[PDB]
GROMACS .gro file of N, CA and C in nm:
model
   33
    1UNK      N    1  -0.406  -0.767  -0.179
    1UNK     CA    2  -0.449  -0.592  -0.249
    1UNK      C    3  -0.332  -0.501  -0.180
    2UNK      N    4  -0.329  -0.403  -0.244
    2UNK     CA    5  -0.216  -0.269  -0.182
    2UNK      C    6  -0.283  -0.176  -0.090
    3UNK      N    7  -0.225  -0.112   0.021
    3UNK     CA    8  -0.299  -0.039   0.082
    3UNK      C    9  -0.302   0.061   0.040
    4UNK      N   10  -0.325   0.207   0.077
    4UNK     CA   11  -0.341   0.312   0.000
    4UNK      C   12  -0.248   0.409   0.096
    5UNK      N   13  -0.127   0.378   0.092
    5UNK     CA   14  -0.016   0.456   0.157
    5UNK      C   15   0.058   0.529   0.073
    6UNK      N   16   0.148   0.617   0.068
    6UNK     CA   17   0.233   0.675   0.015
    6UNK      C   18   0.385   0.672   0.043
    7UNK      N   19   0.473   0.559  -0.022
    7UNK     CA   20   0.433   0.480  -0.117
    7UNK      C   21   0.315   0.393  -0.082
    8UNK      N   22   0.254   0.335  -0.175
    8UNK     CA   23   0.156   0.220  -0.178
    8UNK      C   24   0.257   0.072  -0.106
    9UNK      N   25   0.152  -0.001  -0.032
    9UNK     CA   26   0.263  -0.126  -0.017
    9UNK      C   27   0.137  -0.243  -0.007
   10UNK      N   28   0.156  -0.338  -0.107
   10UNK     CA   29   0.131  -0.469  -0.154
   10UNK      C   30   0.151  -0.596  -0.044
   11UNK      N   31   0.048  -0.650  -0.049
   11UNK     CA   32   0.080  -0.798   0.051
   11UNK      C   33   0.051  -0.893  -0.016
   0.00000   0.00000   0.00000
């Protein structure tokens, strides 16, 4: 899943 950061990060 992708984190909730700005910008968002996907693993």
